[PDB]
Amino acid sequence: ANPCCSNPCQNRGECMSTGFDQYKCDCTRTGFYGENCTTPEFLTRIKLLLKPTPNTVHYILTHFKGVWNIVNNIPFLRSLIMKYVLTSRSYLIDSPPTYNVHYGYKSWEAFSNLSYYTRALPPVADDCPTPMGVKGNKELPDSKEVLEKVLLRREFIPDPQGSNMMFAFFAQHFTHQFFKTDHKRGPGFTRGLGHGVDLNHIYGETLDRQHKLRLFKDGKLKYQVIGGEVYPPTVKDTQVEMIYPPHIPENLQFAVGQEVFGLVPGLMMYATIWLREHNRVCDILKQEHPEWGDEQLFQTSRLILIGETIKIVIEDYVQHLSGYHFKLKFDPELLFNQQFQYQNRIASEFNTLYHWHPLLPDTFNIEDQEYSFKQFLYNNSILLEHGLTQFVESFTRQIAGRVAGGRNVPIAVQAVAKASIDQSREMKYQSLNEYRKRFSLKPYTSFEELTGEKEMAAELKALYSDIDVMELYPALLVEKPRPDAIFGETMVELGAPFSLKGLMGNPICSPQYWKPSTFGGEVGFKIINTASIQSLICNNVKGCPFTSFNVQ
Amino acid sequence: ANPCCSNPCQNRGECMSTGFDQYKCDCTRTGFYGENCTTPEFLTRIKLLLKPTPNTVHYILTHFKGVWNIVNNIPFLRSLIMKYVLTSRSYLIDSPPTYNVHYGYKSWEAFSNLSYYTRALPPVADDCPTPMGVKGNKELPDSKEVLEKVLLRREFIPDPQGSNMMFAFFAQHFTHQFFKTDHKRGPGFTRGLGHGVDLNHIYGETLDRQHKLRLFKDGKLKYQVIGGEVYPPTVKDTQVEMIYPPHIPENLQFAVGQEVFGLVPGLMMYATIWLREHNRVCDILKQEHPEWGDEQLFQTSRLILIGETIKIVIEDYVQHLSGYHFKLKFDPELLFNQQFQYQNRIASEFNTLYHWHPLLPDTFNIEDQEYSFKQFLYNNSILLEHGLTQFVESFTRQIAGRVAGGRNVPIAVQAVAKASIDQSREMKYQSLNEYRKRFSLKPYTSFEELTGEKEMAAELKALYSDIDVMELYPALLVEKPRPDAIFGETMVELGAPFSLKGLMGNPICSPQYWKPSTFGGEVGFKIINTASIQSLICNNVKGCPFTSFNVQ
Numbered sequence A, B: 001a002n003p004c005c006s007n008p009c010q011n012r013g014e015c016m017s018t019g020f021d022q023y024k025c026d027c028t029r030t031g032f033y034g035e036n037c038t039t040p041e042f043l044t045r046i047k048l049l050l051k052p053t054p055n056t057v058h059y060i061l062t063h064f065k066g067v068w069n070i071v072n073n074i075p076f077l078r079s080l081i082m083k084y085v086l087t088s089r090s091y092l093i094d095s096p097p098t099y100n101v102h103y104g105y106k107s108w109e110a111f112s113n114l115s116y117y118t119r120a121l122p123p124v125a126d127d128c129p130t131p132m133g134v135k136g137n138k139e140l141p142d143s144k145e146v147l148e149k150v151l152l153r154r155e156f157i158p159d160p161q162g163s164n165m166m167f168a169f170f171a172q173h174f175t176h177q178f179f180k181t182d183h184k185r186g187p188g189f190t191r192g193l194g195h196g197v198d199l200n201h202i203y204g205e206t207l208d209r210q211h212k213l214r215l216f217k218d219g220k221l222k223y224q225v226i227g228g229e230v231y232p233p234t235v236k237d238t239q240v241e242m243i244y245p246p247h248i249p250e251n252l253q254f255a256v257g258q259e260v261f262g263l264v265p266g267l268m269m270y271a272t273i274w275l276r277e278h279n280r281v282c283d284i285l286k287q288e289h290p291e292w293g294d295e296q297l298f299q300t301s302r303l304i305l306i307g308e309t310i311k312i313v314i315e316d317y318v319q320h321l322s323g324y325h326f327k328l329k330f331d332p333e334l335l336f337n338q339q340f341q342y343q344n345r346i347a348s349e350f351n352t353l354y355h356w357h358p359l360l361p362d363t364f365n366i367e368d369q370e371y372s373f374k375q376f377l378y379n380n381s382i383l384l385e386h387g388l389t390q391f392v393e394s395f396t397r398q399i400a401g402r403v404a405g406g407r408n409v410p411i412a413v414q415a416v417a418k419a420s421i422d423q424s425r426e427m428k429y430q431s432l433n434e435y436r437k438r439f440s441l442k443p444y445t446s447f448e449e450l451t452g453e454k455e456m457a458a459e460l461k462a463l464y465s466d467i468d469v470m471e472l473y474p475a476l477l478v479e480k481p482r483p484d485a486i487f488g489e490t491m492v493e494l495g496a497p498f499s500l501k502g503l504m505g506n507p508i509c510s511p512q513y514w515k516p517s518t519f520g521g522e523v524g525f526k527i528i529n530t531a532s533i534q535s536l537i538c539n540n541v542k543g544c545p546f547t548s549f550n551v552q
């Protein structure tokens, strides 16, 4: 009965009720006017007419390899293009943040309470007649129905971009510092109060936890040596709380910043590499600063590791994801003459579309073994038996699954995929096409346009009837991918703004932080500005095995 | 022994130790280069040579009243100047913030731990040979000595700008939402985790406290009616914790957002006015929105009162303090085409220089009574006996004390002034002249230049010997005022950047918040944009008594 239930305001105008059965659209600064903010202003007609489609742009970025080769080798030109990449979409992220699961209007509670994920689109009001607002049936289609017909893997569909398990586990490890749902409160709540790349998954969310992980000598983190190899300490040594099944022996209860990282040895692998990396930087900083104490060595190392992470995510991780020939660049100075907010609030929808479980293989292939999920989960003895070098060599070779294109979620984690559907609904997510409009994309006009094929589309059309009732999460997983790409348009276009905002919004990218002395001088600064996935593994994994985010 | 103890880097360059007895200055983006960042670049020589002094600017802003009268009546010209006021100094405040009492270098702990006040200048390192670094004696002069010789009031010195008790209590009430020192942790720690104008002094710092204060009808706050007049509820009714001496009767233990506001009836007066204003706005919003619930009425009213507060502070409160003929303006749109960070972290030094206790009179004169401090403190029966109208009429007529110029701290609060000295030292504040340099002011070259007279200057010279060892806090209260002004140059030039940053950095000034629907439509928006101290009192105090921030 809320008069705004039909989402009547277009072009990011805001709907407000003006009585029981009337509404008003606030078209302030949308570029549009009129009752529903649908009449474009003159300057808006022009730019709309001159704006290429995302699929047109994606074509240009993935072709003309020779032209892009020239651009990359002209620092001024590459800088200019990367600068546009960073600012072109800032208008798409509300910063400071606005809505959350409990607030469809702006409020001081929504702005100030950091325990919420923020929301790119307000929730559908509780009293709306249908889950998507006014369209569709009283209830959305059975989520198990949707799961089985279009989401579950039949046969493994490999990623055509060649993502490997180093990438898959890097994505899982990296994202689990800011996707940390507080299930004691609900799916719209997080425990990552830093709301970004603070490396709490290495150092701990709280000071108490951090101090239990620290050696308090030379800035270093505690560690144990097993078979000549450095691994994280135990729960017994540190008193750090970790999530482990009751049968895990004490000497295998490794303690790391993130309490769930004992769930899979792929995560413990990266937890071990980054712990080693922190202590390596401690040695470097102590050599440069014999006069420094333990506290300053730890803090400066932490700042450098934050920088390395952002460097790797942009220039290796996103670079791989994009398939662009243009070489992305981590350069905070590109924003110094630009309007940009050095802050971030993690959006629920960003969490939702980062649910890349189709990446997971049917078995995890380390050396000559092929572990099933049951053997793999919560089993750190695999990491000790094979070691990090063999983990890297094996995971560099093993292909990851395709995420878009449908029917590639391994049934081992079908409960998680069903929870993504159920809890998206619980959080009153708007429809896929509302989210498409919110990120300047054309609404899909049929299920076949969404999938690009006929069979999944037909199953989805029988379940949903109307395309405007299609839900965001399943749509991402069934969407037609870009040509030979891992993702469809919606994933890239909705996820990229959150992603870059979460990286460039970090305080170390602000002008007063982005200078050598923040990082202990030019030597510490250079560790950030030369980091890579290859060198991260090379400095911290015995034998310096080759690695990358794609197979071969 | 720290090689940076002498603060060798000038012009906001950063000092870093490079060994036990060597340092390096990071001159990045300071406009200077060289070992100590003292060699100006060419563009810097130019702007330095074209920059008027703050006392020259102050002269122009307080004279040529005829010319300023023309500027004020040209909206485009007034906007352009106000825009410069807001941004001209943007650069003086580290945002995102940097140092705090425990960190003289940038660290993730210092960035992320909101329980700290931030620091405009890093603390003097613990191992420096002298309290100011390397200058001065082993110990700073006896704080009792300083207090008695140059700070304590002999005879009441009135403010020549005519500040009254409406102003002094507005300053106390307003600032005590973000100056809330956590004495359980130490002077460098705050309990105002919002770090700004969130009106927690009305609504409570925590949700638990806010909900005990709320009526949960029509968005309103709980209240009682005493003699036909609306007052805050009691501790007994609400269970809201308040600080009161044991002898206060239960029916006089008024409960308000800020737990210390029973300290003086001057605070409870404003607590009551703002309580009435919140519920007044609730009535207005309910009339515009019969379809709204209690929660949306409460949240929208709170946002409007935040807007009213900022409006009043800029256009009435700062306007009065400045003595400018130019009319300052609260207009968030002025920053929309400007680089600006919509965030704020409350600085310790901002707290320190807002210690305006010389404002206080020797007695509080309400109607025909003259209450001493002992009679006035923790005595809400005074507020009930006279009522709000008589409070307003009396406090509008009573003159406040001059803040700069020396010897005007009332003896009733001498323990507070001595604590300001002692805790500035505990927090390892740098010297007055270091803070002057940090805010682009010339160091004082003698005590007589600081005070502008001879007797206090000689007093201080016997205590401190060297001017470069003079402390920030005593200097503000003994400083030579501007001609017939309440403050000296240091107070204004250091405090104005923090002040405007805390006001404009608020999220409601950001583009996505600053639009009518955030505030329930044009009617709620208009409440912000027409607010004034006079209308605040007129709508909420019986009889609409005249008020202002100056006498007569």
Ligand SMILES: COc1ccc2c(c1)c(CC(=O)NCCNS(=O)(=O)c1cccc3c(N(C)C)cccc13)c(C)n2C(=O)c1ccc(Cl)cc1
Binding pocket: A057, A060, A061, A081, A084, A085, A086, A088, A089, A318, A321, A322, A323, A353, A354, A487, A491, A492, A493, A494, A495, A496, A497, A499, A500
């Ligand atoms: C492809 O696959 C991907 C996949 C993921 C991607 C990206 C690309 C990108 C790059 C991007 O953001 N790509 C659009 C640039 N479009 S653009 O800047 O608006 C633009 C518009 C018009 C012309 C342009 C242009 N010219 C000169 C034609 C050059 C460059 C940009 C132009 C980022 C950040 N990803 C994420 O990290 C990310 C992480 C997690 C999730 Cl879930 C989702 C994404």
Ligand SMILES: COc1ccc2c(c1)c(CC(=O)NCCNS(=O)(=O)c1cccc3c(N(C)C)cccc13)c(C)n2C(=O)c1ccc(Cl)cc1
Binding pocket: B057, B060, B061, B081, B084, B085, B086, B088, B089, B318, B321, B322, B323, B353, B354, B487, B491, B492, B494, B495, B496, B497, B499, B500
């Ligand atoms: C006077 O007493 C006061 C006292 C307190 C004041 C102010 C003025 C000011 C106004 C301001 O900030 N005054 C600098 C103007 N100048 S610039 O630096 O803005 C500038 C530079 C060069 C030329 C200019 C120019 N033209 C036309 C030549 C026009 C306007 C500005 C120009 C504000 C905010 N304070 C605080 O809130 C306040 C709150 C608590 C604390 Cl303890 C301390 C301060």
Ligand code: HEM
Binding pocket: A168, A169, A171, A172, A175, A179, A180, A181, A264, A266, A351, A354, A355, A356, A357, A359, A360, A377, A413, A416
């Ligand atoms: C390798 C084996 C993996 C397993 C066994 C697994 C399993 C799970 C489970 C059970 C959850 C629900 C968490 C909870 O409710 O407490 C979850 C959530 C999630 N998964 Fe995975 N996952 C794996 C890999 C990945 C990968 C490769 C990604 C790629 C990005 C990913 C992305 C996510 C995200 C973002 C969440 C949300 C976490 C949160 O909100 O706290 N996962 N996963």
Ligand code: HEM
Binding pocket: B168, B169, B171, B172, B175, B179, B180, B181, B183, B263, B264, B266, B351, B354, B355, B356, B357, B359, B360, B413, B416
């Ligand atoms: C009217 C009677 C006033 C009394 C009795 C009074 C008393 C005090 C006392 C005892 C403190 C120390 C409290 C503590 O350490 O926790 C204090 C702090 C303070 N007072 Fe006043 N004061 C009054 C008015 C003012 C006024 C007019 C201002 C002007 C802005 C002001 C600004 C401050 C500030 C900034 C602090 C430091 C607050 C903090 O860190 O928590 N006070 N006052």
Ligand SMILES: *[C@@H]1O[C@H](CO)[C@@H](O[C@@H]2O[C@H](CO)[C@@H](O)[C@H](O)[C@H]2NC(C)=O)[C@H](O)[C@H]1NC(C)=O
Binding pocket: A113, A114, A115, A116, A184, A185, A186, B206, B207, B208
């Ligand atoms: C942030 O918001 C959540 C949601 O309202 C708050 O959590 C509630 O807190 C109350 C007590 O104040 C509990 O009775 C509820 O059970 C909590 N609900 C949920 C869903 O957790 C939380 O307290 C807020 N945090 C802050 C810092 O204000």
Ligand SMILES: *[C@@H]1O[C@H](CO)[C@@H](O[C@@H]2O[C@H](CO)[C@@H](O)[C@H](O)[C@H]2NC(C)=O)[C@H](O)[C@H]1NC(C)=O
Binding pocket: A206, A207, A208, B113, B114, B115, B116, B184, B185, B186
């Ligand atoms: C912010 O920093 C303060 C100061 O280090 C932290 O307070 C300390 O917390 C430990 C336990 O973690 C106590 O043993 C100390 O007594 C506390 N010291 C002081 C001076 O309060 C505080 O925990 C930090 N806050 C966060 C959120 O990490």
Ligand SMILES: CCCCCCCCO[C@@H]1O[C@H](CO)[C@@H](O)[C@H](O)[C@H]1O
Binding pocket: A053, A055, A056, A059, A060, A483
């Ligand atoms: C030099 C300019 C060349 C521009 C090439 C444009 C190619 C557009 O490319 C096509 O766009 C469609 C839009 O939906 C997609 O459906 C197709 O898959 C995509 O390949």
Ligand SMILES: CCCCCCCCO[C@@H]1O[C@H](CO)[C@@H](O)[C@H](O)[C@H]1O
Binding pocket: A148, A149, A152, A153, A154, A411, A455, A456, A459
């Ligand atoms: C691996 C999990 C499969 C769940 C089977 C339940 C019914 C699934 O459903 C059907 O699956 C068929 C075979 O793939 C498809 O051809 C149909 O389009 C689909 O509706």
Ligand SMILES: *[C@@H]1O[C@H](CO)[C@@H](O)[C@H](O)[C@H]1NC(C)=O
Binding pocket: A006, A007, A008, A034, A035, A036, A038
């Ligand atoms: C605006 O939208 C409503 C339904 O959402 C529609 O009935 C109305 O006619 C629209 N108005 C205009 C001018 O398009």
Ligand SMILES: *[C@@H]1O[C@H](CO)[C@@H](O)[C@H](O)[C@H]1NC(C)=O
Binding pocket: A374, A375, A376, A379, A381, A382, A383, A385
């Ligand atoms: C854990 O992995 C080891 C190999 O390192 C294997 O022998 C064992 O069976 C696994 N445990 C479970 C419960 O699968």
Ligand SMILES: *[C@@H]1O[C@H](CO)[C@@H](O)[C@H](O)[C@H]1NC(C)=O
Binding pocket: B006, B007, B008, B034, B035, B036, B038
């Ligand atoms: C820099 O300052 C130090 C002391 O702080 C001084 O000894 C040195 O001569 C200065 N160097 C220059 C180039 O001015």
Ligand SMILES: *[C@@H]1O[C@H](CO)[C@@H](O)[C@H](O)[C@H]1NC(C)=O
Binding pocket: B374, B375, B376, B379, B381, B382, B383, B385
């Ligand atoms: C409190 O104020 C009343 C006047 O309202 C006065 O009679 C009483 O003496 C005061 N109490 C104290 C303890 O001073």
